[PDB]
Amino acid sequence: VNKERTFLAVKPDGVARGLVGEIIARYEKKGFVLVGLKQLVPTKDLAESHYAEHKERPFFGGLVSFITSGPVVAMVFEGKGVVASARLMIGVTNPLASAPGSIRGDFGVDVGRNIIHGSDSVESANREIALWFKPEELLTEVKPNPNLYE
Amino acid sequence: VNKERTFLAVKPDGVARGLVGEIIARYEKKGFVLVGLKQLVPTKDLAESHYAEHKERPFFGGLVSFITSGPVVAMVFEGKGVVASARLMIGVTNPLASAPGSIRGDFGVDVGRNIIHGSDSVESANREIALWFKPEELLTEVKPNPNLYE
Amino acid sequence: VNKERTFLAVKPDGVARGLVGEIIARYEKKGFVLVGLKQLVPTKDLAESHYAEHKERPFFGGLVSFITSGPVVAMVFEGKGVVASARLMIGVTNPLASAPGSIRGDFGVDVGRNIIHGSDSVESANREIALWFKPEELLTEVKPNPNLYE
Amino acid sequence: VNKERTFLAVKPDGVARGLVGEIIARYEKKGFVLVGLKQLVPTKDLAESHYAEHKERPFFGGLVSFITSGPVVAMVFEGKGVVASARLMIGVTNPLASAPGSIRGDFGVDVGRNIIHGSDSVESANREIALWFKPEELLTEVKPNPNLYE
Amino acid sequence: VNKERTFLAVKPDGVARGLVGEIIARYEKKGFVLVGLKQLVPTKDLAESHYAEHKERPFFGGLVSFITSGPVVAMVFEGKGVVASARLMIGVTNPLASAPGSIRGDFGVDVGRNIIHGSDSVESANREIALWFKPEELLTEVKPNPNLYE
Amino acid sequence: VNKERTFLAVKPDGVARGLVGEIIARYEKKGFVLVGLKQLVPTKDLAESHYAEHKERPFFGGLVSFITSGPVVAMVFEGKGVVASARLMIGVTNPLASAPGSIRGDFGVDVGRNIIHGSDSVESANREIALWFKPEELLTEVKPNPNLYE
Ligand SMILES: Nc1ncnc2c1ncn2[C@@H]1O[C@H](COP(=O)(O)OP(=O)(O)O)[C@@H](O)[C@H]1O
Ligand SMILES: Nc1ncnc2c1ncn2[C@@H]1O[C@H](COP(=O)(O)OP(=O)(O)O)[C@@H](O)[C@H]1O
Ligand SMILES: Nc1ncnc2c1ncn2[C@@H]1O[C@H](COP(=O)(O)OP(=O)(O)O)[C@@H](O)[C@H]1O
Ligand SMILES: Nc1ncnc2c1ncn2[C@@H]1O[C@H](COP(=O)(O)OP(=O)(O)O)[C@@H](O)[C@H]1O
Ligand SMILES: Nc1ncnc2c1ncn2[C@@H]1O[C@H](COP(=O)(O)OP(=O)(O)O)[C@@H](O)[C@H]1O
Ligand SMILES: Nc1ncnc2c1ncn2[C@@H]1O[C@H](COP(=O)(O)OP(=O)(O)O)[C@@H](O)[C@H]1O
Ligand SMILES: [Mg+2]
Ligand SMILES: [Mg+2]
Ligand SMILES: [Mg+2]
């Protein structure tokens, strides 16, 4: 619509590296509205339900261990085309091949340490949102700048 | 002392102007650790307890009315002297009198729209953390860059 | 040549969003020289002469109404390949498909609210320049850093 | 008071060092509104009236000679206490004595090359706006983020 | 490996333009470790050995004259895929065709004045490193953040 | 006076936290010229001479032990009043008491981890430059933006 939402998670590395404010600000600058925000230490269950599509990927184990190893900053951003757009702002999986100006392109080197998670579709955003936030955690009242939308 | 915590709140005006990342980043850069973080629309009750000291003052009402009017991003940072330091980083009540480089100095013009709330003392930080955050919402084991403290 | 000029206009949204300084600075950083600069509220005539190529596009009406709805910051930048280069710095029409690091890519979401106008050719730059600035408004004396040009 | 205006001038040195965006952005960020903006090479006459208070001083000549030597970016910002605030944001006469975070503190080293001019009072701002700007060059209806003032 | 190194040189222009801190910081942000750093005025011999592959290119003479015309900030950065990655962060030869967010894309206009040199392969990095630094100038002790590498 | 020089050292903590570019940039922006720059792991002997004034103090040992523990980025900047100015830009001994906008104010929390060393006087700058730098490592002919000094 224009009320599309995405699930973004600043991974433990990213939190550790003090990149939280920097990530949020990129999205705030873009004109996306923060409709949900929290810091938590993901549980094994959440992590596994989160990355369930990767269940049989050789890095799963490590992935799940790492995401649960420290605080994660989870958030939901709402705005027109926010899913595909947050995905672009992030870069690609490998932070080395990520274009400069992208979050990963500017701050990571290693795949295992690629700082942020972003939902890759409306479907998965919807699913991840529900997984990480209770609807009472999410705003109903959205108001970005009127200067953003026609 | 390295464990000291402060209660910081990005007010509805800070949130609508898109200064959340920007603010977190400042504290992140300073070396303070994020032990608690969430976005919520405060409650008249929270709002009133939170501003209890000002109940006999003329702006009390506006204060409470304002705070409850939109999303707030509440957070607690931990670190050596964080209470006094975050105050200095914020500026003074009046943004116009607040020095450039401070949060208020840099982004605010009006007292009732001074973007952020910072605990003014350990006692108050302690009271305010409790008030706004559930124990399970705060990190227990905090890991700050080891380059920060001796 | 190397004395090529382009017409850039920070649209009402962009002005409203306080992105003026930020846009200028990108161009100053790049090494382009500001040879003309002003803030004005475009008239219907200017707007229509400006976007005349779009006269029969379904959004014309809206375009013209919006550009005239508030202050515009018009400017001319001079430098080698400034037209094509300012165009790259801007992104594409849709700020959503605009690469991160581009003005539109970093700050817009909506096409109707894509913050800046940049001439798309030497021809059109020449025409827009003449349309928006009297030659007395334009510098004759250009001096970028000697550190920029061989 | 919310309507108060100040006269700011980015001097020839500020302009050549590419600090125009950078400076506008600071004021933009503060929440001040841009009611007047233009680039011009000052006139000896303008220059002298503008610096009239210093005509009996030794540096008067240099001052006028300097100001008239290249492009200046003149602007008027409106907002509550903007005159005093923009002064604070600028620093003191001597850049070296100006605190980090201020314009002079951050970018200047020498008094005769102190980048910017800011009106020191309402009377002076009023005199200087008139002097440098044509009434039709200033906005009449100013719209500041509504998140700025109570 | 992950201990790969690259030779980066901030050219005289770039030094002149005060872009040194800005370049370094991009690399520090990325997570690369500075294992060697110095400011020197390259000699004709160094310059020619450096750009030996270009010996018969029409710009060689000019290239060599320019690199020797002022201080160069030479440095070595270590990290996974640092060669290809530093090359991406730089842009392409022509700063005009360089993507926004890239060093050249953000700061240059002219090919002759494209601010930085980056080795283009492991081979050439190895060779340039040895050419510009004595092994006593290079760290042996590498420690980037553990937050960077899996 | 325009020729004045200062000794600045980015300490092992400044270096590990990736604040080298960030720090150089500040000084670069101010208009100070980089006359000497290198990365080295200090020597107990250097370290002790350098901190000679504090040999009768309790933290002397820690100081020397700390300094020698990792890479330091030593640099000398030249410019009018640079000694006093760079001090102001650094903050006070205690980062927590250092004002926002200053280096310590912005990035440090602890006295023993206060990121940078700046010469406190001409005599000391002169002594410290000599100590840390070889004459041939310092520029002889310094060219500062001509927009900086009158
Ligand atoms: N080859 C790998 N080795 C280690 N971790 C990996 C690898 N591939 C992916 N990952 C991790 O798995 C996460 C999920 O993988 P993927 O869906 O492919 O990435 P993305 O986050 O780009 O969508 C990545 O962000 C990263 O944290
Ligand atoms: N006189 C006033 N008028 C309007 N709002 C006020 C006034 N005094 C305080 N406030 C508001 O209420 C808050 C009250 O806290 P106070 O202790 O006075 O300030 P601070 O936040 O700097 O500690 C202020 O930050 C501001 O939002
Ligand atoms: N489909 C659209 N809906 C609304 N506004 C549009 C649309 N397409 C273009 N615009 C507006 O018209 C301006 C001119 O259009 P166009 O030439 O295609 O864009 P550009 O500014 O990228 O060159 C755009 O910048 C935008 O402000
Ligand atoms: N003693 C001086 N030497 C050189 N230039 C000076 C001197 N005093 C003032 N100036 C210059 O003229 C301006 C005069 O205005 P003044 O009221 O003294 O300072 P300010 O701009 O801070 O209000 C200064 O900003 C500076 O450019
Ligand atoms: N056509 C040219 N005119 C002038 N200088 C050039 C030209 N092509 C290259 N250079 C200079 O030669 C350097 C080496 O050239 P090249 O290997 O092609 O560039 P790069 O630095 O992108 O690898 C460039 O960075 C630039 O400083
Ligand atoms: N009381 C202390 N405890 C720990 N470290 C200290 C103490 N006093 C000084 N230092 C350390 O040694 C340096 C000594 O220099 P000093 O003259 O006291 O400070 P400054 O660096 O601000 O000039 C400090 O910057 C800091 O790293
Ligand atoms: Mg994926
Ligand atoms: Mg077009
Ligand atoms: Mg090459």
mmCIF file with all atom_site columns, C-alpha atoms in Angstrom, chain C residues 2 30 80 147-150, chain E residues 11 13 51 57 59 62-63 66 92-98 104 107-117:
data_model
loop_
_atom_site.group_PDB
_atom_site.id
_atom_site.type_symbol
_atom_site.label_atom_id
_atom_site.label_alt_id
_atom_site.label_comp_id
_atom_site.label_asym_id
_atom_site.label_entity_id
_atom_site.label_seq_id
_atom_site.pdbx_PDB_ins_code
_atom_site.Cartn_x
_atom_site.Cartn_y
_atom_site.Cartn_z
_atom_site.occupancy
_atom_site.B_iso_or_equiv
_atom_site.pdbx_formal_charge
_atom_site.auth_seq_id
_atom_site.auth_comp_id
_atom_site.auth_asym_id
_atom_site.auth_atom_id
_atom_site.pdbx_PDB_model_num
ATOM 1  C CA . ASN C 1 2   ? 34.718 22.240 -17.475 1.00 0.00 ? 2   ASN C CA 1
ATOM 2  C CA . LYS C 1 30  ? 31.946 16.995 -4.890  1.00 0.00 ? 30  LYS C CA 1
ATOM 3  C CA . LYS C 1 80  ? 33.208 19.388 -15.323 1.00 0.00 ? 80  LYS C CA 1
ATOM 4  C CA . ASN C 1 147 ? 43.013 20.784 -6.130  1.00 0.00 ? 147 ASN C CA 1
ATOM 5  C CA . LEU C 1 148 ? 40.054 19.702 -8.194  1.00 0.00 ? 148 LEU C CA 1
ATOM 6  C CA . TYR C 1 149 ? 41.065 20.243 -11.686 1.00 0.00 ? 149 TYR C CA 1
ATOM 7  C CA . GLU C 1 150 ? 44.212 19.197 -13.427 1.00 0.00 ? 150 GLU C CA 1
ATOM 8  C CA . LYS E 1 11  ? 47.113 11.831 -3.237  1.00 0.00 ? 11  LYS E CA 1
ATOM 9  C CA . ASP E 1 13  ? 44.856 16.865 -3.911  1.00 0.00 ? 13  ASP E CA 1
ATOM 10 C CA . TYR E 1 51  ? 53.072 3.842  -11.504 1.00 0.00 ? 51  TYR E CA 1
ATOM 11 C CA . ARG E 1 57  ? 50.566 6.398  -20.901 1.00 0.00 ? 57  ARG E CA 1
ATOM 12 C CA . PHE E 1 59  ? 49.559 11.200 -18.550 1.00 0.00 ? 59  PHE E CA 1
ATOM 13 C CA . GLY E 1 62  ? 51.945 14.664 -15.283 1.00 0.00 ? 62  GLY E CA 1
ATOM 14 C CA . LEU E 1 63  ? 50.974 11.882 -12.932 1.00 0.00 ? 63  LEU E CA 1
ATOM 15 C CA . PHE E 1 66  ? 51.670 15.718 -9.372  1.00 0.00 ? 66  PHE E CA 1
ATOM 16 C CA . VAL E 1 92  ? 36.277 4.056  -10.799 1.00 0.00 ? 92  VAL E CA 1
ATOM 17 C CA . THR E 1 93  ? 39.109 6.099  -12.344 1.00 0.00 ? 93  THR E CA 1
ATOM 18 C CA . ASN E 1 94  ? 36.878 8.936  -13.455 1.00 0.00 ? 94  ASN E CA 1
ATOM 19 C CA . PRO E 1 95  ? 35.363 10.451 -10.329 1.00 0.00 ? 95  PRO E CA 1
ATOM 20 C CA . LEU E 1 96  ? 32.424 11.663 -12.476 1.00 0.00 ? 96  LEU E CA 1
ATOM 21 C CA . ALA E 1 97  ? 31.299 8.151  -13.326 1.00 0.00 ? 97  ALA E CA 1
ATOM 22 C CA . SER E 1 98  ? 31.885 7.020  -9.737  1.00 0.00 ? 98  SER E CA 1
ATOM 23 C CA . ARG E 1 104 ? 35.810 9.394  -5.759  1.00 0.00 ? 104 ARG E CA 1
ATOM 24 C CA . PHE E 1 107 ? 34.583 14.066 -3.818  1.00 0.00 ? 107 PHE E CA 1
ATOM 25 C CA . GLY E 1 108 ? 36.180 14.336 -7.239  1.00 0.00 ? 108 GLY E CA 1
ATOM 26 C CA . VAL E 1 109 ? 35.393 15.661 -10.650 1.00 0.00 ? 109 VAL E CA 1
ATOM 27 C CA . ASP E 1 110 ? 38.661 15.263 -12.506 1.00 0.00 ? 110 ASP E CA 1
ATOM 28 C CA . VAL E 1 111 ? 40.550 12.120 -13.395 1.00 0.00 ? 111 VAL E CA 1
ATOM 29 C CA . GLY E 1 112 ? 43.940 13.784 -12.777 1.00 0.00 ? 112 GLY E CA 1
ATOM 30 C CA . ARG E 1 113 ? 42.588 14.840 -9.397  1.00 0.00 ? 113 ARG E CA 1
ATOM 31 C CA . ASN E 1 114 ? 40.875 11.607 -8.249  1.00 0.00 ? 114 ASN E CA 1
ATOM 32 C CA . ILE E 1 115 ? 42.119 11.861 -4.613  1.00 0.00 ? 115 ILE E CA 1
ATOM 33 C CA . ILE E 1 116 ? 43.209 8.324  -3.721  1.00 0.00 ? 116 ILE E CA 1
ATOM 34 C CA . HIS E 1 117 ? 45.183 5.414  -5.010  1.00 0.00 ? 117 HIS E CA 1
#
